[PDB]
Every structure is written in C-alpha cells, then in structure tokens.
Design an enzyme around this catalytic site. Structure first.
Site, PDB file in Angstrom:
ATOM      1  N   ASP A   7      -0.560  -7.204   1.682  1.00  0.00           N
ATOM      2  CA  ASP A   7       0.141  -5.939   1.795  1.00  0.00           C
ATOM      3  C   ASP A   7       1.644  -6.159   1.920  1.00  0.00           C
ATOM      4  OD1 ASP A   7       0.676  -3.301   1.994  1.00  0.00           O
ATOM      5  OD2 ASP A   7      -0.258  -2.977   3.947  1.00  0.00           O
ATOM      6  N   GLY A  64       2.891   6.040   9.394  1.00  0.00           N
ATOM      7  CA  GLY A  64       4.205   6.354   8.869  1.00  0.00           C
ATOM      8  C   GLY A  64       5.206   5.226   9.018  1.00  0.00           C
ATOM      9  N   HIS A  81       0.795  -1.224   0.000  1.00  0.00           N
ATOM     10  CA  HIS A  81       0.000   0.000   0.000  1.00  0.00           C
ATOM     11  C   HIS A  81       0.830   1.278   0.000  1.00  0.00           C
ATOM     12  CE1 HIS A  81       0.469   0.284   4.494  1.00  0.00           C
ATOM     13  NE2 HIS A  81       0.341   1.572   4.233  1.00  0.00           N
ATOM     14  N   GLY A 113       5.406  -0.735   6.114  1.00  0.00           N
ATOM     15  CA  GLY A 113       6.511  -1.357   5.401  1.00  0.00           C
ATOM     16  C   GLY A 113       7.667  -1.733   6.310  1.00  0.00           C
TER      17      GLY A 113
END
Ligand SMILES: CCS(=O)(=O)N[C@H](Cc1c[nH]c2ccc(OCc3cccc(C(=O)O)c3)cc12)C(=O)N[C@@H](CCC(N)=O)C(=O)NCc1ccc(C(=N)N)cc1
Ligand SMILES: *[C@@H]1O[C@H](CO)[C@@H](O)[C@H](O)[C@H]1O
Ligand SMILES: *[C@@H]1O[C@@H](C)[C@@H](O)[C@@H](O)[C@@H]1O
Ligand SMILES: [Ca+2]
Ligand SMILES: [Ca+2]
Ligand SMILES: [Ca+2]
Ligand SMILES: [Ca+2]
Ligand SMILES: [Ca+2]
Ligand SMILES: [Ca+2]
Ligand SMILES: [Ca+2]
Ligand SMILES: [Ca+2]
Ligand SMILES: [Ca+2]
Lengths: 142, 254, 191
Positions: free
Chosen positions: B90, B190, B41, B193
């Site tokens: 994701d 934030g 994403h 990942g």
C-alpha cells in the site's frame, strides 16, 4: 581437625573451626543442636567461589553461597567483567554513535555518513545542513 | 486521527493534502520538492486522473493563508504487485507537475537509507502519525491537521496481542503495527497516505504510511502502516526515471 | 534456527544477568532491553553465549520495569523475557556480620552494609543507600531456645548474660516485598 587426645578437651569453635578446619561432627559437638549446626555449616563449608579470581579487568569479587558477584570498572561489564565497552563500536550498537548513517567495516572502524542536504562534520559523527531547508527539520522550532 | 491533538501550524510541514476534483481524498508526505509519498489504495476509485491535486503548507481547511501551495499531480506510481481493494504494497509515489517552494511551512521529510531504517529507526519506540482524517470511527473528519504519537510493534507481538478476525488481511513483511489496543488512540481512514515519522538525533525520517486496520482505535487492534524501508530502492529508482505519458503508472516490485 | 526460551532473570544486589536456552547450534544471539516507553537498546551483539549481563542498563533506574527480548540469527525470530523491576525483584545478597562489642549487660551487633551494582557519582551504593527505609535486618540469636531482633538500620542492640556466650546470624529483609522478601542467612558468629 583431630589430633591425639585433643578430643578429651571440651568443644571450642575458635580452636577447632577458626584456627583449624573442622568437620561436621566437630561442628555438631560445639553447637549441639541440629539447626544451629546446619545454619553454621551452610556458610562454613560453602567454600569461597572467589578463589578462582573470576572477575577480569580489575574487577572485584564478592563471595556468595555457591556463587559470586563481580563489581567491574566503569569501562567494563559482563558476569566476569569480560566485556570491553570500548570494543563495541559497531553500527548495531546505538547506530555506532553516528548522527545519521552508519557503515560497518571489517577490521577497521565504522564510518558515519549523512543524508543529502547535510555534510559530515570534522568529528566524523555529526551532520550539518548544507541547504536552507534540509529534510527532517522543522524551521519554526530551529 | 483518534485521540490526538492539533499539530501546531508549521510543526507538520511535510504533511500533504490530496484532493480529487476539489474534494478531500487522502494524506501524503513530501520527501523533496517534486515528489510525494502516499498510499496506493487512495486511488482505488479514481476516475478523473487529471483532477488530482496536492496541497502543501496546509493546516486549517477552513481558512486560507499564503503558506498554502497547490500542484497538479502529474503522476501516480503504484507497485505492479498492488491489488485494488487489498492491503499489501500500500504505497504510492506521486510526481508534482511543478516543484513546491521550500519555506518555514513547507519542508520535506527525509527518506532514510534502508539499513539505517531497519537497524535503527525501527527500534525508536514512538513516532508521529497525522492527517485530517476521522476523529472517531465512522465519525466526521478534522478541520485542523491532527497529530498523534504512537508506539511501534514487531509483527510477532502485534499478532499475539491482537484479536483474530476470520478471513481478514494478513500482516506481511511490507507492513508494521503501531498504536494502542485499548481503543483510545490510532489513525483512521481519512488519514490514509499520511506519514509515520520517526525522530532520531535531531532529524525526522519517513518510516511508515497510514495504510489500514480493523476499524479505528478498536479494542484488541493496532493500526497498520506500510513498511517504507522495503521500498527505499523502489522509490529512489523511480524518482530518477522519466515521466510517463499518462497519469497512472504501475512499476514492478522489487 | 529456533527461538530462545526459558528466559530467566538472575539478579542479586542488582547484578542482573539474563539467561536463556538452548545452547546455540549454528545460531547466534542479540539482546534488546527497554522500558515500556523507551527505545530498544541492543546488548551482547551476536553472542554465542546463552546469557547477557544487563546490569549497567538496569541500574540506570532500578525502579523502572524492564522488558528484554532475545533475537536468534542463523524480522528475526525472538522471544520476550518476563518483565523485570529491579527494586522489587533483585535478590538480597547474603549478609555479613561486621562485628559486635559487648558492654556490660548489652551487645551491639553490627551488620556490614554490603555494596550493590548501582553506581552513583563514581561509586557503588550500599543496599541501605538504595532501599533506605524499605530495608531491615533481622537477628536470629541464641545462647551457645531461639531469639530474634529487628532493626531499621544496620545494627542490633540486645540484652545478654555475661559469662554466657551467644551465636548470631542476620538476614536482609524488605518487608514491603511479596517475593524475595528475605536474603539467605549470614554465616554464624559467636562471642
Ligand atoms: C474491518 C473493515 S475496515 O475497518 O475497513 N479495515 C480494512 C481492513 C480489514 C480488517 N478486517 C477485514 C476483513 C475483510 C476485508 O477485506 C477483504 C480481505 C480479505 C483477506 C485479505 C485481504 C487483503 O487485504 O489482502 C482483504 C478487510 C478487512 C481496511 O483498513 N481497508 C483499507 C482499504 C482497503 C482497500 N484497498 O480498499 C482501509 O480502510 N484503509 C484505511 C485505514 C487507515 C487507517 C486505519 C487505522 N489506523 N485503524 C484503518 C483504515
Ligand atoms: C571460580 O570459582 C567459581 C565457583 O562457582 C566458578 O564459577 C568460576 O568459573 C571460577 O573461576
Ligand atoms: C573492587 O571493585 C572494583 C570495581 C575495583 O574498584 C577494584 O579496585 C576494587 O578493589
Ligand atoms: Ca577436634
Ligand atoms: Ca583440634
Ligand atoms: Ca570435638
Ligand atoms: Ca590447633
Ligand atoms: Ca585464635
Ligand atoms: Ca561424635
Ligand atoms: Ca569429636
Ligand atoms: Ca561461598
Ligand atoms: Ca487552509
């Protein structure tokens, strides 16, 4: 127990329930009171559950009311000490004691492996870095 | 990161910083000198694909030192099953234009074998999540790399211990929850990942990716991470593949 | 496959066994136990029994609170157990009066300090070793009216009437407790 004419003699816990097996009625004749008789009868008539010798592999049995408890040897566990702590060298059991990778093997024993950048030591379970900066290690702490 | 602490410089060496056009975009995890694992994403709104940068050896976004290394992202591989704007699958595998130099401040996290991860790592209670994300819900991001230790949960418990939110993302078999439901600690937007690293017998392994959740550190909710173990094969096959012409590549999954 | 249910803890003197239902049909089980912040440790791998001895695990720290879960095999289906805190929940075994010697106008009743499953330095700790001050024994005696005595040790020093005989019975007790505060009555012994 009852023999001819013995009942003429007054009650006696020793001669009737210790030196012999006594019925509830005989017990009731020594204790008289209901509660006293029952408090005595629960244990007296419970029967030692350790008679079957349920505790395996050199364990010790401790009698309880309508049950028992097994005290096992260091290398054993289980309700009856039937579990061999030495027969669990499979991967799902603490990763088979392997430092990194574990591979099961039907029949034989499990084998350990390592991630790229490491090698299996002679103990067959540990892994050591084969490069200067192996993955998963923090340099400033090593 | 919400409710965490600064990761001492050098103690989160596999952490990656992703920038698009020089701006902070997402977090990521290095697993070798050429490849980085991040979240899918993170690229939903990318337009300038030739302007993606990965920085390693980062720590303090306000002070430059020689431990930092920049590389253009030559490729962003995303599962063909992923849908922009959603949560399932994701994950993203990024190929750096050039390999980074392994140093005391730049080291890759181990990509574990599938069964080892499902059978062993998955049952290691705590794991570390980190990044330069928000310090509070809707708040501002961090200047120094933050880190947080969070407990893992099996999906059944996650679902049972969470408050239902009508018409919201389902927790699939490609995800797993971790964190606290008392509103005190969790990762945040934030941090996307970034790595969810598990320590096991002297070595750290990649078990998750910061993916989604109901707000950040919301009462009655847990953070949700991509279950990396479901992609081990997918990742290893792609890392052995030939680079494609363009930047973005959608690879089938399984 | 069906998930286990009615998970129950069966513990006496720390001998702790986890039991559940139903009687497996084309499905085996694997148990996991842990402390709130500890890792999950598996036990009774792929067993067909509907019980799992967790004694060696819980005696590692009887004051910790453990949680267990039973996995079912044909993430897998599972069911969590009730939380279990050994020190506060393990049942006290039935006591045994070790002896009693009369001395004029007083009698000394000694309660055998039975052993527990808690290991330490290659030995089994007594109930006294484990609970210390938290454990007391109460005596229920009478002339063979009701009488009672309590001791913070494993012995009772009471008054009696020589010529007259008394019967005795004891119970292990952990006053601070709320549930399972007392053990069952010991067998009756008379002078
Ligand atoms: C509450 C909004 S929210 O806070 O932004 N949460 C959403 C999920 C979220 C929670 N409740 C929702 C209801 C409808 C909705 O979008 C529509 C929707 C409906 C049904 C299925 C799906 C689906 O994803 O399959 C999506 C999304 C959500 C959420 O997390 N969305 C993603 C991005 C989705 C994308 N691909 O663009 C996101 O913000 N990820 C970053 C992130 C990282 C860590 C945390 C953390 N540890 N804490 C939280 C967030
Ligand atoms: C010995 O007796 C006990 C009585 O409960 C029984 O449970 C055991 O199986 C037997 O060996
Ligand atoms: C009873 O306890 C078990 C564990 C063994 O030590 C036996 O030898 C003993 O009699
Ligand atoms: Ca008789
Ligand atoms: Ca007789
Ligand atoms: Ca008689
Ligand atoms: Ca006789
Ligand atoms: Ca005699
Ligand atoms: Ca009669
Ligand atoms: Ca008679
Ligand atoms: Ca008995
Ligand atoms: Ca910097």
């Amino acid at each position: 127990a009852n023999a001819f004419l013995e009942e003429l003699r007054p009650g006696s816990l020793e001669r009737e329930c210790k030196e012999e097996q006594c019925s509830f009625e005989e017990a009731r004749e020594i204790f008289k009171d209901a509660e006293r008789t029952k408090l005595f009868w629960i244990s007296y008539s419970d029967g030692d559950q350790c008679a079957s010798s349920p505790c395996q592999n050199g364990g010790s049995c401790k009698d309880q009311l309508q049950s028992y408890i097994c005290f096992c040897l260091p290398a054993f566990e289980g309700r009856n000490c039937e579990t061999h702590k030495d027969d669990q060298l499979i991967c799902v059991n603490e990763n088979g004691g392997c430092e990194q990778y574990c591979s099961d093997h039907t029949g034989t024993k499990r084998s350990c492996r390592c991630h790229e950048g490491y090698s299996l030591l002679a103990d067959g379970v540990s892994c050591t870095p084969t490069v200067e900066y192996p993955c998963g290690k923090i340099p400033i702490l090593e | 990161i919400v409710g965490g602490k600064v990761c001492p410089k050098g103690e989160c060496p596999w952490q990656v910083l992703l920038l698009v056009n020089g701006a902070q975009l997402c977090g990521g995890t290095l697993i070798n000198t050429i490849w980085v694992v991040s979240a899918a994403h993170c690229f939903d709104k990318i337009k300038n694909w030739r302007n993606l940068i990965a920085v390693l050896g980062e720590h303090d976004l306000s002070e430059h030192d020689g431990d930092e290394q920049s590389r253009r992202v030559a490729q962003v591989i995303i599962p063909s099953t992923y849908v922009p704007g959603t949560t399932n699958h994701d994950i993203a595998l990024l190929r750096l234009h050039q390999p980074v130099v392994l140093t005391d401040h730049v080291v890759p996290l181990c990509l574990p074998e599938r069964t080892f991860s499902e059978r062993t790592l998955a049952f290691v209670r705590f794991s570390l999540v980190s990044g330069w994300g928000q310090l509070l819900d809707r708040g501002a991001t961090a200047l120094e790399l933050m880190v947080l230790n969070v407990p893992r949960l099996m999906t059944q418990d996650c679902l049972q211990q969470s408050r239902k939110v009508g018409d919201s993302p389902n927790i699939t078999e490609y995800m797993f929850c971790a964190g606290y439901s008392d509103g005190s600690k969790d990762s945040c937007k934030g941090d996307s990942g970034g790595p969810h690293a598990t320590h096991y017998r002297g070595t750290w392994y990649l078990t998750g990716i910061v993916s989604w959740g109901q707000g950040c550190a919301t009462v009655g909710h847990f953070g949700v991470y991509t279950r990396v173990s479901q992609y081990i094969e997918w990742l290893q096959k792609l890392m052995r593949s030939e680079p494609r012409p363009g930047v973005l590549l959608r690879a089938p999954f399984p | 496959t069906v998930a286990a249910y009615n998970l129950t803890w069966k513990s006496t003197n720390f001998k702790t066994i986890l039991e559940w239902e139903p009687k497996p049909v084309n499905q085996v089980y694997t148990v996991q136990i842990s402390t709130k912040s500890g890792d999950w440790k598996s036990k009774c791998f792929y067993t067909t029994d509907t019980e799992c001895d967790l004694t060696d695990e819980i005696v590692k720290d009887v004051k910790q609170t453990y949680l267990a879960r039973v996995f079912s095999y044909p993430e897998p289906l599972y069911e969590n157990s009730p939380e279990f805190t050994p020190y506060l929940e393990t049942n006290l075994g039935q006591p045994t009066i070790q002896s009693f010697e009369q001395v004029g106008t007083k009698v000394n009743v000694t309660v055998e300090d039975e052993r527990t499953l808690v290991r330490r330095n290659n030995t089994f700790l007594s109930l006294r070793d484990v609970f210390g001050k938290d454990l007391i024994y109460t005596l229920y005696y009478w002339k063979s009216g009701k009488k009672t005595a309590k001791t913070n040790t494993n012995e009772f020093l009471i008054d009696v009437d020589k010529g007259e005989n008394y019967c005795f019975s004891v119970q292990a007790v952990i006053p601070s407790r709320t549930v399972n505060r007392k053990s069952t009555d010991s067998p009756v012994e008379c002078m």
